[PDB]
Amino acid sequence: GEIITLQAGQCGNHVGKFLWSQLAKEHAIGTDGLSQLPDSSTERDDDTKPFFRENSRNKFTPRAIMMDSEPSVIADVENTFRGFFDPRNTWVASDGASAGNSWANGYDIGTRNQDDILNKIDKEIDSTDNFEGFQLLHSVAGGTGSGLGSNLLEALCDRYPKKILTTYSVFPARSSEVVVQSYNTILALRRLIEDSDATVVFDNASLLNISGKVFRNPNIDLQHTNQLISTIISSVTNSIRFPSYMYSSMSSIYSTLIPSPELHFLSPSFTPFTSGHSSYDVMLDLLDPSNSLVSTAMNNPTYFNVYNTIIGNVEPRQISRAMTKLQQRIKFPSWSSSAMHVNIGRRSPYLPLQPNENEVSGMMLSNMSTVVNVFENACNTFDKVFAKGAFLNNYNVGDLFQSMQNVQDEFAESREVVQSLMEDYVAAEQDSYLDDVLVDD
Amino acid sequence: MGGEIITLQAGQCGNHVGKFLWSQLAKEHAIGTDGLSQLPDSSTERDDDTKPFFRENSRNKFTPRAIMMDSEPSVIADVENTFRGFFDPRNTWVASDGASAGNSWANGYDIGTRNQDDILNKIDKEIDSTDNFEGFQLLHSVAGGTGSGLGSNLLEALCDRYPKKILTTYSVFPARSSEVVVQSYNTILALRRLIEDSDATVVFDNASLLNISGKVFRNPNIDLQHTNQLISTIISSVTNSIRFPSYMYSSMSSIYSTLIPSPELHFLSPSFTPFTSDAHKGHSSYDVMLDLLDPSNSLVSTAMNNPTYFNVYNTIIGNVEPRQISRAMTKLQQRIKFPSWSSSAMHVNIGRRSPYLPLQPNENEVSGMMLSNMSTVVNVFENACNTFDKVFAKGAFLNNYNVGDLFQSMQNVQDEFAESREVVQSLMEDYVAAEQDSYLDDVLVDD
Amino acid sequence: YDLINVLKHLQQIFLGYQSGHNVLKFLTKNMGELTKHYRNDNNANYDKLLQNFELERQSENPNNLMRQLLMIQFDTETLPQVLSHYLQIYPEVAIYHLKFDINIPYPLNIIISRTCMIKYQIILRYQLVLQYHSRLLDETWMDLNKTPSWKYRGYSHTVKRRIVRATRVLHAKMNHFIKTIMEYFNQNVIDKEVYSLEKCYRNPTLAVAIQNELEGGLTNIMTNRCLSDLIPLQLQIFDIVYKFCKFIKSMRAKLCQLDPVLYGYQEDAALELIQKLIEYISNASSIFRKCLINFTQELSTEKFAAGIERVLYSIVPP
Amino acid sequence: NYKLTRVLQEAVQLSSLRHLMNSPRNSSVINGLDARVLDLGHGSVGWDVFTLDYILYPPLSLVLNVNRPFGRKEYLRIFNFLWRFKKNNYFYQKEMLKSNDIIRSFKKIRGYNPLIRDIINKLSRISILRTQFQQFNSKMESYYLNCIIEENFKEMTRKLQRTENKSQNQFDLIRLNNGTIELNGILTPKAEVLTKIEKTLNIDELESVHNTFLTNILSHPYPTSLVLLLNSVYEFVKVYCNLNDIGYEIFIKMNLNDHEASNGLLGKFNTNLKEIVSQYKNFKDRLYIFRADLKNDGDEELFLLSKSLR
Numbered sequence A: 001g002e003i004i005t006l007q008a009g010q011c012g013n014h015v016g017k018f019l020w021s022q023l024a025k026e027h028a029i030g031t032d033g034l035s036q037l038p039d040s041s042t043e044r045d046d047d048t049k050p051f052f053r054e055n056s057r058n059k060f061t062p063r064a065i066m067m068d069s070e071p072s073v074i075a076d077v078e079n080t081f082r083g084f085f086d087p088r089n090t091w092v093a094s095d096g097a098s099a100g101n102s103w104a105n106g107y108d109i110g111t112r113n114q115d116d117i118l119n120k121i122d123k124e125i126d127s128t129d130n131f132e133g134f135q136l137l138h139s140v141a142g143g144t145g146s147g148l149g150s151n152l153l154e155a156l157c158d159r160y161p162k163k164i165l166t167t168y169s170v171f172p173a174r175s176s177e178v179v180v181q182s183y184n185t186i187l188a189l190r191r192l193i194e195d196s197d198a199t200v201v202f203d204n205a206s207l208l209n210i211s212g213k214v215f216r217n218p219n220i221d222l223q224h225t226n227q228l229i230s231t232i233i234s235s236v237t238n239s240i241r242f243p244s245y246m247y248s249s250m251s252s253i254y255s256t257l258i259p260s261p262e263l264h265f266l267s268p269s270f271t272p273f274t275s276g277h278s279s280y281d282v283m284l285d286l287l288d289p290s291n292s293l294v295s296t297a298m299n300n301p302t303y304f305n306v307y308n309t310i311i312g313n314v315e316p317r318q319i320s321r322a323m324t325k326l327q328q329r330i331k332f333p334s335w336s337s338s339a340m341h342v343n344i345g346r347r348s349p350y351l352p353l354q355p356n357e358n359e360v361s362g363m364m365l366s367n368m369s370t371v372v373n374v375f376e377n378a379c380n381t382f383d384k385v386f387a388k389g390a391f392l393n394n395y396n397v398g399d400l401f402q403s404m405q406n407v408q409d410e411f412a413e414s415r416e417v418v419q420s421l422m423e424d425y426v427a428a429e430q431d432s433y434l435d436d437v438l439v440d441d
Numbered sequence B: 001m002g003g004e005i006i007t008l009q010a011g012q013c014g015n016h017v018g019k020f021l022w023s024q025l026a027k028e029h030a031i032g033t034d035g036l037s038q039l040p041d042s043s044t045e046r047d048d049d050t051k052p053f054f055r056e057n058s059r060n061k062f063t064p065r066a067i068m069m070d071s072e073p074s075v076i077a078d079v080e081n082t083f084r085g086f087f088d089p090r091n092t093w094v095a096s097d098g099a100s101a102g103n104s105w106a107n108g109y110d111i112g113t114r115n116q117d118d119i120l121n122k123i124d125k126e127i128d129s130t131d132n133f134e135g136f137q138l139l140h141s142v143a144g145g146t147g148s149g150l151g152s153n154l155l156e157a158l159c160d161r162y163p164k165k166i167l168t169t170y171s172v173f174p175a176r177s178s179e180v181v182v183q184s185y186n187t188i189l190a191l192r193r194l195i196e197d198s199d200a201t202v203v204f205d206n207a208s209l210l211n212i213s214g215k216v217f218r219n220p221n222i223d224l225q226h227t228n229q230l231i232s233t234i235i236s237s238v239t240n241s242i243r244f245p246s247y248m249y250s251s252m253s254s255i256y257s258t259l260i261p262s263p264e265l266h267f268l269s270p271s272f273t274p275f276t277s278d279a280h281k282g283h284s285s286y287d288v289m290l291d292l293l294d295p296s297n298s299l300v301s302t303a304m305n306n307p308t309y310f311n312v313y314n315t316i317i318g319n320v321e322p323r324q325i326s327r328a329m330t331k332l333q334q335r336i337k338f339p340s341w342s343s344s345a346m347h348v349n350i351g352r353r354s355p356y357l358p359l360q361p362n363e364n365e366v367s368g369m370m371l372s373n374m375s376t377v378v379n380v381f382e383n384a385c386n387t388f389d390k391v392f393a394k395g396a397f398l399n400n401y402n403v404g405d406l407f408q409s410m411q412n413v414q415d416e417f418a419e420s421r422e423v424v425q426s427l428m429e430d431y432v433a434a435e436q437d438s439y440l441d442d443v444l445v446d447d
Numbered sequence C: 001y002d003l004i005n006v007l008k009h010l011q012q013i014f015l016g017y018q019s020g021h022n023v024l025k026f027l028t029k030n031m032g033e034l035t036k037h038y039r040n041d042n043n044a045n046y047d048k049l050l051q052n053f054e055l056e057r058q059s060e061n062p063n064n065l066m067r068q069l070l071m072i073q074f075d076t077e078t079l080p081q082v083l084s085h086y087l088q089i090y091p092e093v094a095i096y097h098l099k100f101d102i103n104i105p106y107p108l109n110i111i112i113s114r115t116c117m118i119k120y121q122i123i124l125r126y127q128l129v130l131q132y133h134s135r136l137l138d139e140t141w142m143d144l145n146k147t148p149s150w151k152y153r154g155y156s157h158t159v160k161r162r163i164v165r166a167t168r169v170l171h172a173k174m175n176h177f178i179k180t181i182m183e184y185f186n187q188n189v190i191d192k193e194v195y196s197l198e199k200c201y202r203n204p205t206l207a208v209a210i211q212n213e214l215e216g217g218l219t220n221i222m223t224n225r226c227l228s229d230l231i232p233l234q235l236q237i238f239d240i241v242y243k244f245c246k247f248i249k250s251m252r253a254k255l256c257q258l259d260p261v262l263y264g265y266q267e268d269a270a271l272e273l274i275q276k277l278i279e280y281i282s283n284a285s286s287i288f289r290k291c292l293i294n295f296t297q298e299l300s301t302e303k304f305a306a307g308i309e310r311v312l313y314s315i316v317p318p
Numbered sequence D: 001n002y003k004l005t006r007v008l009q010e011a012v013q014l015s016s017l018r019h020l021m022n023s024p025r026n027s028s029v030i031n032g033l034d035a036r037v038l039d040l041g042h043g044s045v046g047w048d049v050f051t052l053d054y055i056l057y058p059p060l061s062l063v064l065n066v067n068r069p070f071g072r073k074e075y076l077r078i079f080n081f082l083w084r085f086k087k088n089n090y091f092y093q094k095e096m097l098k099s100n101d102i103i104r105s106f107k108k109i110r111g112y113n114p115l116i117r118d119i120i121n122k123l124s125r126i127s128i129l130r131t132q133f134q135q136f137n138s139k140m141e142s143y144y145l146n147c148i149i150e151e152n153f154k155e156m157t158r159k160l161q162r163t164e165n166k167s168q169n170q171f172d173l174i175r176l177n178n179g180t181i182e183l184n185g186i187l188t189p190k191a192e193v194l195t196k197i198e199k200t201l202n203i204d205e206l207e208s209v210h211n212t213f214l215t216n217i218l219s220h221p222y223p224t225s226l227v228l229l230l231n232s233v234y235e236f237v238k239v240y241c242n243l244n245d246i247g248y249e250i251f252i253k254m255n256l257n258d259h260e261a262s263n264g265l266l267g268k269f270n271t272n273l274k275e276i277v278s279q280y281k282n283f284k285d286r287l288y289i290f291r292a293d294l295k296n297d298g299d300e301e302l303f304l305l306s307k308s309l310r
């Protein structure tokens, strides 16, 4: 079960380097590819294999490909860390270029050279043991996201139709550029919605709200918060990396996280830590929206699915008591009778619980109805400007170049696909949506 | 079933490559630049040298069983000035008149007959040095008209003089589309005769080798002297089974028996794993061999248009595990395509890393090489095809290369040229028939 | 002797201690023949699975002697049949008969008694069978969400409801229940025992006390309600989930008759098929849910358990 | 006897072994090399009449047990088996090289248009057909040696040096025929002593390792499945030997006499060509059955052979 991570532009690669660093630390595997563990033992209680390739000389590199349109970003990571990356598996765009921060730009690089990005991906898969689903991280609106990330999902669906496609989505434009980026966001979502199996959204507000409270430099926004987000995106593989039993693979988890795949985006909730206590409280602390990654006014949302993994000095009696708020606080899935699922333990042994520590940390994720606040921002913005003529006519590259008719139709059809996502979030919480499913049967 | 082998250099291309070859062979057997054993003599290891390639004297000097020919006496001399006692000059010879040497056609084709006695005296004297003789191996370039012409006259003369012996060559053509206009007669004629001998050759255009040398050596300035290293590893490893024999291969007769069932299609396309000739792959014994089929590391023009294979030979060297390579064989079987006619067993040997090389710090750094018989190998000299088509189709330059009173009549020139084009076309006719299943019914169903 | 490493290995083998990837690895490939043994004679090709296991043993860690000593045998008696000798377990009034064991050298055998091995064997068989069925359901979910026939468009609301949503609603409920049970069994049963044993190695003074705890934990596991009340009902839960999984997989072809891509596959014939598929889901979902609720209610009268409440919560509707 | 023994000596000198033959720290091992002549129940047979030998003398005779009259001289049964493959290699290798000589001259002269075209390619295709026959034996020879004899040999040599702290596999289990694998000879907790010397073999143990080897190969569907195919290759070659000699006469005589003399040489070919075709078909069907036997055995190695025949 091997995982290869595809890292799109600054989003993918910066978080990627921060994550690989966090993993370099968690497995004592080395930021330079050299194990930090003593040679006093040949045995291990972890599993680095799925994320790192072991060489014949016991040296390590991650199973990841940096995205091709932004070679300066690829170089940032490959040169800063270097020994812990393998550049020979990295595709670099055929023209050495990125024609704007747009869908058309990266989409066209991707469609023109789909075969070359796939040849690099496909050749790495052949070197591994049982490839497990693809992992992708991108800014939905950006050149590497709306453009190439969108193209990768299409490319992967046809080349690897038998594999799971899972992505990480980060927040859309945070400024007035939204009148442009919202169009890219929508075209990007059309592809994300139609092609991925599962995903998740990370809101800027939490990166910044956390930044303001955790760093002693509160003026930090997307940089450095990338390490905070990389500790958030660690909970995704800890049960694999520091293996457990209950939820040890992708196919064994996604059926539990999002039974109804159209609502493919989860809402994470996490308590940050440096790189409080009780299982009772860490679980309960994550029901508080201020720790969520898609924060909003809906302090009383409904849920379709809730899941949580707690890692640390775990106490099952406390977990049992924490369950009281499952019963009192979660508006029930009146349409499907779902319930919360959990997993526990497997603290990295190389970053052990310290003496006198009873602290735990963990991740709660949920399929929540009221997550429209991180999607509507584009859907209900780009359309009012679009209706007056697209504001992306300076990105007439590839499909947007071929015809102004394609420009207007791609944007409008993608909005309808996104609208279905918005319609599904809402329809899904209605009891009448699914009651007729079994009654008229 | 086997026997001794005499190598030959013919034209400077085989001397530049030849110094890399002899240097690597010398490392492989602790021979030294003066040809003398560099080892303390512990009287161990039966394979401490290869009787087939060297003549060992009282100084434990290993005299190469080789003849060196060129048209450029300074290249012969510079190799002799590199192999400072190792390569014995009595077997070298220069085929040259400064005036004819610049004419690739005339130099080669005139010397091939004019100097047939000088060419043969070195050859006949060395073949008669032994009883258990198996064959010859030449370093050449079809572009290298000097080699084309003397090589062509030897191909035919040796087939007649020694009817049961094995006669082969490794031929490197430059990867150039316009520099091959002037080569339009000697390269096609080299083929006109290479097609006439089923033992004749492994062929390459140096196209990928040039690009390989520029990515693997820390020297982007790709040139022949930085590319001949790659040629050296691919050719040196061929005879690993002769130099360090085991069970199936010990000789060219054995290799022949399993790799070229059709005497008609003897032309092979080479590839290799990382090597230590000038290297540590970091993979299992099955992975290193799978990469040999990846055209990006082909030594010739890379991607082939879904090549049909008629026969593939491989050798793996290092801590080889028959079970690991079973994953590789399975995977190669799903990539190698053929009609039922060529659904032959593929043959993979296991070679030996020479005991005189620096000790390998990790025995699992398995290396290897591939040789394959494919229909698309005809694309290797496509650049020559482009210019000989333009030239031959027009009757261009008849005797404008000063033919040495051979076919002095323009029609007779065109008839020789026609035979060389008949050969180009018949080569592909056999490669295409080889892609048929029905090929089998022609002599089994029918009487 | 390094008894700690040895027992940790034993736990890795029978309790699934930090072995999620090993159980999934075990199921990989082997599920293909495992489904045939209760659909075949005792002359079934057990050897094929045994070879797959032997090959895995060849590709094994040189120090993990406990895996090296591990072997698979087949019984003819499946878990509920062999378990009929237990006073607390009620018989049917039969899917897996695969069992693991280990040959133990005397320095260890005096600790690792046959009684504990039997308890380990039976506990693992429970864990494996439950993982097996859980995995079939998970792969079924992926088949549902990958296969083109399950992604049809523009037919009717009647079919979107009766075939696709109905499949997802039943599948999700099956998933929530089977997973919650597994979570309980590990989180509130096995983890406690592994933990207890770790506590007993805190500079222990008595060899016997350790031995007593090893047996103690095995009994605590065997007398749990998740076995004693569940087995007689598990028989129906698995039979329904198992058949459902087969059903959904066959629908990868049968539902092609909802889209034009179907072209004898003709629309009136398709309606006969579509309605038959609908009835199956309705009958299966009706019996599955009713049986579980009847049980859910029975399990609520017993006050005996943290995850029992969690399991019941996962089945009881809003 | 003079020739028989002179040749054996020449063979060594010819091999790379010759320098060890003359080695000052050894040399003498080679002196144990010998050979025998078999009375096959017929006084004029050849080939099969030969077997190779080696004679041990004390103290070596006490450890390496080369079987004498007390047994069946089992080591010569494997020699003869391998020898039959080697005999095959001689027979087909010679003829394919004869064929290439015939071809090199056959295609040397072209005359009378299309008539030449009608023949030629008919016979180069035999040499091509022949490849299936020789590849089978070459590949099986590789299998028998590289996957059995060599592997068991390596096993012996691994065992012999285990003394020097080699991989610590001290988990030797005994497999029972009922499928139970029970640890034995290791009935100790690694004999760890906690609070704190060469694992060498004695004479009988060394002798045991030798006999173990013989057992590993001798005890390794019939061995005659190979024989049917190995014999088929030999019969192909003998027919082929005649095809090559007739073919050379076609090349020379039919071209001194342009279909003027010895007309009808191809009639002897038709008899012989039909036999190689029949033999080919029998070979291909038996080889097909052979791969069928391989998959119907259950041994992963034989499955690999079935796949690798392709």
Ligand SMILES: Nc1nc2c(ncn2[C@@H]2O[C@H](COP(=O)(O)OP(=O)(O)O)[C@@H](O)[C@H]2O)c(=O)[nH]1
Pocket: A008, A009, A010, A011, A012, A014, A015, A070, A100, A101, A102, A138, A139, A140, A141, A142, A143, A144, A145, A146, A170, A171, A172, A173, A174, A202, A204, A207, A222, A223, A226
């Ligand atoms: N969370 C996070 N968001 C980012 C980061 N970099 C850019 N973004 C967001 O991503 C979107 C722009 O995408 P970007 O990756 O910069 O463009 P691209 O290189 O063309 O893919 C905007 O929504 C930015 O706020 C980052 O490091 N972290």
Ligand SMILES: Nc1nc2c(ncn2[C@@H]2O[C@H](COP(=O)(O)OP(=O)(O)O)[C@@H](O)[C@H]2O)c(=O)[nH]1
Pocket: B010, B011, B012, B013, B014, B015, B016, B017, B070, B071, B072, B104, B107, B108, B141, B142, B143, B144, B145, B146, B147, B148, B172, B173, B174, B175, B206, B224, B228, B231
């Ligand atoms: N690989 C390689 N190719 C060479 C070398 N020297 C010449 N060539 C190539 O050989 C062809 C010309 O043949 P050359 O040997 O120089 O002429 P000759 O002396 O008449 O045989 C062209 O394709 C050259 O690129 C060399 O040292 N190495």
